[PDB]
Structures are given as structure tokens and as C-alpha cells.
Amino acid sequence: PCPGACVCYNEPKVTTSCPQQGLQAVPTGIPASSQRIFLHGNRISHVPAASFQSCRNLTILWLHSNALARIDAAAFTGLTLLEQLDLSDNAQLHVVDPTTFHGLGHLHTLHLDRCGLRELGPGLFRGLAALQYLYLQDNNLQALPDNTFRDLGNLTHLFLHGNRIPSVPEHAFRGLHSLDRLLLHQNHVARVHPHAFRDLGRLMTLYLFANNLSMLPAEVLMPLRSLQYLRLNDNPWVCDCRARPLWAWLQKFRGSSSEVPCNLPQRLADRDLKRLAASDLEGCAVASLPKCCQA
Template identity: 50%
Template structure:
């Protein structure tokens, strides 16, 4: 509680001394309340109806800033520019936040977790994540993203968790994940993915969990999974897999790895419908021609695969006020649905 001589606590809010915390959650505030103590390290403003964020509102001591489940539709340039200590920023579940300026998060060199789930973002501007070299967790699920341009994540060398499920991505291009050398978990399920460039996962040497289920994948030409030496858990179910000659690269990859995988049920041809692709036999491919890698590249680049089109995002539920001290080794289980990994 605020001691004598300390700045007054804003009306309808609760303030704590150690660590310096201001809790203004669920008070129907339409704007950030005035008079926030400048030394506050944790600001909890979630579950209000705040519509806009303005520069100069938050003090430089802020480490944790929760603004999820509001009505935010605009963020003034410079709002987060002078927050050198900020480690966690949660803007999730703001369905009116549809556009972000390229420099919205510039200068947040200590930011470790950025939550942008369920904001109806159809696209992300080039450079939006520039300079966020401390970022470890990035939540972009359930936004309606249509595409991701190459090098969007190029500065995120320390990112370990990337959540892109529940969007409208249709393709993954060659450079979409370039720079993510520390990535451990990549969730791309519940999108509309129909093509993945054979080198889309290049450089993800530490990736252990990959979710591609509930998409529109018929085949994976060019063996893109071969670039993932650390992969342990893979989900490919709920895709219309063609178990003809196009299945051979994926089938061959399964034969040389020991990855824990979901079933991969065939959708075609009719006589193989329901068969697990992993359980096909070598003689099922006897009539198939030898593959031409160059042809596969051309197919990916000239067909559905190029252009940086996308990945999907499913959703992170809003959180109740908790104790956001140091970031956990793995994200809270509340961020996962339907059996996603803890």
C-alpha cells in the first residue's frame, strides 16, 4: 500500500509497495487514469474499455505493462519509446487494434514477451520487430494475418516461442523465419496453409515443436522438414494429404527420423483414404518418377508458395491478475488450448 510521502494512488486503483505496482484492472476506465506513480514497475490496466494510448503516459520504470482486453484502436507514436526497462507488454484481445505503425515497439531493447493475440491484425509492417533482440515470446495468434513478409523476424535471434495459429496464412516463403536461430516452438496450426517453401524452415536448428495441423496441406515438396535436426514433436493431422507420389518426400523423412508425430491420415487417392501416410510401404512408390529438386523449387515459387503469404494464429485467452515477476521458463499453461504443449 502506498506509504507516506509516496505519490497518491489513482482513484479506483490499488497500489502496492514491493514491487511498486498499480492495479487498475476491470474498472471500466475509458482512458489510462491520470496520476500513475512514476516509479511504478508493474501496471495492470487489463479488462477496461481504454480506446487509445498516448505518448508520455507510462513512466520509465515500467517493467510489466498489461493492457489486454480493452478497446484500444490507436497507439500514438512514441507511446513506448521511453520505457527502457519494459520486459513484458500485453496488448492482446484488443479487437479494434487493426493497424500498427512500423516503429511502435522501437527502443524496447529489454522486452522479453510481446502479446498481440486476437487484435484483428491483417498484416504486420516491415520493421515492426526491429531491434527487439531480447524478445523470447511473441504471441500473434487469432489475428487474421494474411501473409508474413520475408525477414519480418530477422532481429529476433533470442526468440524461443512464436505463436501464429488461428490466422489466415496460405503460404510460407523462403525467408519468412530467417534470423530465428533460437526458436524452440512454432505453432502454425489452424491457418489456411497450402504451400511451404522447401527452405522455409532453414536456420531453425533448435526447433523442437512444430504444429501444422488443421491447414490445407496436400504435400510437402522438397523435404522442408529436413532442415529441423532438433525436432521432437510434430502435428500434421487435419490436412488433406495426398498419398500418391507427392507423399514420398514426407514418407521418406519419417523413415529416417524418430520424431513424435500425430497421425497423418491420407485424404486421397480414394483407396488410401484414412491410411496413415507414415505407414505406406516402399512398393507404394514403385511407379513414381525420380524427383527433380529444381522443379519443386519452381513449383513453390511460381505457384502457391511465393510472396511471403502466410501462417495462422489461434488465440491466447486473457489472463487474470497474477504475479508477473520474472518470466517463466515456459509460457503459462493458460496460453494453450486443445492440448497444446505446456
């Protein structure tokens, strides 16, 4: 039967619904035929291995807005039909065992926003070949290691804003051939490797505003042949000789772009790099140092 104060019904999908009823733990005796399990808004602190293993046909599991501090690495083992997993708004989770998501080959959406996550461990997203949406915003990430998303060939939306990512290495986004939207704003990005976006030929939206970029090689943006929306505002852009390549790329860009506000030199403060004449970019505003500032 139906456990605790949960509500169980069959249409449109077999559902076990137990939201906001003061649960401290995952209830036992969840009906095995459950296709959807809603446990959001309680005070659940742990997800043991045995939690959902009877539920063969499970496709949707919501655990957002709880008090999750730990998830057993075997919590979601054998849930081969799982399509939606929501662990968001558990700000004290901090860490997910790198094997937690292994075997989830039907997973389409993974909500990990506002989980206080400190890092993306090796192999955390291995084998998630069906994943389309990955929410990682508003965590505590301080790195984007190479090949973190290597197997995510069907991913279309990747949200990484509201972290503390300091830089983007060459192969951080390797394998993301289907990616359409990449949100990297409100981080600490000080540099992007020249070939970091090589595989993003189908990207349509890129947000990089509210970071720490003083410059960006044109090579960074060159592979983004499908780009339609670009945001680069709220960065400390240096509008001198080092900006000439980005300037030139911007002149030919047919999409929509934010302001690219100059921070230096003072005479160009808050004017748009995009809207400057090439003659404004002569010289060096500093006089670690870019090539044109050495010659």
C-alpha cells in the same frame, strides 16, 4: 498519490493496479516510480503518447481485455526496461504502427493475441533482440513477409496459429536461431518454400495441422535436426508418387509425429502416410502438377 480507484503498493514491485473499474482512458498521474502497471479489463480505447513516459522503471504493462482501437506510435518510447507488454484481447485494434515497439531492447514477452491484426508491417519487430515469447495467434494475418522476425535471435516461442496465412516464403523465419516452438496450425498454408526452415536447427516442436497442404518437399523438414514433435494432421495429403520424399523422411524420424492422413486416392483415405509401404505410393492420383505426375 494513487490515481482514481487504482490500488498502489510497493511490494514485491512498485505497482499501480487499476483493473476492471470502468476506465475509458489511461489514467493521468500514474506514480512515476511504477514498475508494474495493470490496466486490463477496462474499456480503454486509445493509448496516447504521454501515457507512461514518467514511469522510468516500468517493466510490466498489461492492457489486455480493453477496447483498444489505436495506439500512438510513441506510446512506449523510452521505456527501456520494459520486459512484458500485453495488448491481447483487443479484437478491434486491427493495426499497429511499425515503429510502435522500437527501442524496447529489454522486452522478453509480447502478447498480441486476439488483436484482429491484419498484417505485420515492415520493421514491426526490428531490434527486439531480447524477445523470447511472441504471441500472434487468433488474429487476421494473411501474409508472413520475409525478414519479419530477422532480429529475434533469442526468440524461443512463436505462436501464429488461428490466422489466414496462405504460404510460407523462403526467409519468413530467417534469423530465428533460438526458436524452440513454432505453431502454425489452423491457417491456410498451401505451400512451404523448400528452405523456409533453414535457420530452425534448434526447433523441437512444429505444428502445421489444420492447413491446406497437399504435399510437402522433404527439403522443408530437412534442417529440423532437433525436432521432437511434429503435427501434420487435418491436411489434404495426396498419397501418391509426390509423397515419396516426405514418406522417406518420416521413416527416419525418431521424434513423435501425428497421423499424416491421406485424402487421396480414395483407397488410402484416412490411412497414415507414415505407416504405408513404399509400394502404396506408386503412380499419380491426379494424372501446378508435380514432376512424377508428368513423367
